[PDB]
A paper describes a structure:
Here, we present and characterize a PDF enzyme issued from the bacterium Streptococcus agalactiae (SaPDF) which behaves as an excellent structural platform to describe PDF-inhibitor interactions. In addition, SaPDF contains the typical insertions of type 2 PDFs12, including an eight-amino acids loop folded as an α-helix (insertion 2) and a long loop connecting strands β2 and β3 usually referred as the CD-loop (insertion 3).
The ligand binding site is localized at the interface between the N and the C sub-domains, as evidenced by the structures of the complexes between SaPDF and synthetic tripeptides. Crystal-soaking experiments were conducted with formylated peptides (Fo-Met-Ala-Ser and Fo-Met-Ala-Arg) but led to deformylated molecules in the crystal structures as previously reported for other PDFs2627. This is due to the ability of the enzyme to deformylate formylated substrates in the crystal packing. Indeed, the free N-terminal amine group coordinated catalytic ion and was hydrogen bonded to the catalytic residue Glu175. The hydrophobic methionine side chain fitted into a deep hydrophobic S1’ pocket composed of several conserved residues (Val71, Leu125, Glu129, Tyr167, Val171, His174). Finally, peptides were in a conformation mimicking a β-strand which was hydrogen-bonded with the main backbone peptide bond of Gly130 from conserved motif II (E129GCLS133), Val71 from conserved motif I (G70VGLAAPQ77), and Gly69 which preceds motif I, linking the two β-sheets from N- and C-terminal sub-domains.
Author numbering: 2 to 204
Write the structure that this text describes.
């Protein structure tokens, strides 16, 4: 099964492991994971984070042929489980100093959900890209500006977190995968760049 292939100790996730638009797995509602986690589910999360770290590293990305990512969802690996990884780096200053914190968000989340959110909407100015979609897709992907999420970590510990900005967008994008929703579902059908008043456009 897919999962067996992915959790092999020597196996590194690459783009040949990522399923693409058209595969039905991407449209299902993924199954909740139960605790305590199986070994496979723990390992899968670790491999998914490793994939993100590799995608962000100029060397490994080039070694393995990776498109950069800041989030990955298990359905994109053909695994219909509610497991996401997110890895959002902070940036250097103009002087080339590293940020105080490497990342603004770094988590492998089990059973994540949005529990509340702002009335306000937001969208990335640059639109969204998807590792599973090999097409140019223009437009504003209209999301909640701010969200409160719940999720469990690999140990079974429950977290409750509020997010805003880019990090809010990322998490939402990944939770959508485990509900079978694609980014372009949230692009206006008639004018991809329509702006309803009060939409927060994030640069
Ligand atoms: Zn592989
Ligand atoms: Zn482990
Ligand atoms: Zn590595
Ligand atoms: Zn709650
Ligand atoms: Zn609501
Ligand atoms: Zn995605
Ligand atoms: Zn929502
Ligand atoms: Zn459409």
């Amino acid at each position: 099964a897919a999962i067996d292939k992915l959790v092999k100790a020597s196996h590194l996730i690459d783009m040949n492991d990522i399923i693409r638009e058209g595969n039905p797995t991407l449209r299902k509602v993924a199954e909740e994971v139960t605790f305590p986690l199986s070994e496979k589910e723990e390992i899968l999360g670790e491999k998914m984070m490793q994939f993100l770290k590799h995608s962000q590293d100029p060397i490994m990305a080039e070694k393995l042929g990776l498109r950069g990512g800041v989030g990955l969802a298990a359905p994109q690996l053909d695994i219909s489980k509610r497991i996401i990884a997110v890895l959002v780096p902070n940036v250097e200053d103009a002087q080339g100093n590293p940020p105080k914190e490497a990342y603004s968000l770094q988590e492998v989340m089990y059973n994540p959900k949005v529990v509340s959110h702002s009335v306000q909407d937001a969208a990335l100015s640059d639109g969204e890209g998807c590792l599973s979609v090999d097409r140019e897709v223009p437009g504003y992907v209209v999301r909640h500006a701010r969200v409160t999420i719940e999720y469990f970590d690999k140990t079974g510990e429950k977290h409750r977190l509020k997010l805003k900005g880019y990090n809010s967008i990322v998490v939402q994008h990944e939770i959508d995968h485990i509900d079978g929703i694609m980014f372009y579902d949230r692009i206006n059908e008639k004018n991809p760049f329509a702006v309803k008043e009060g939409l927060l456009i994030l640069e």
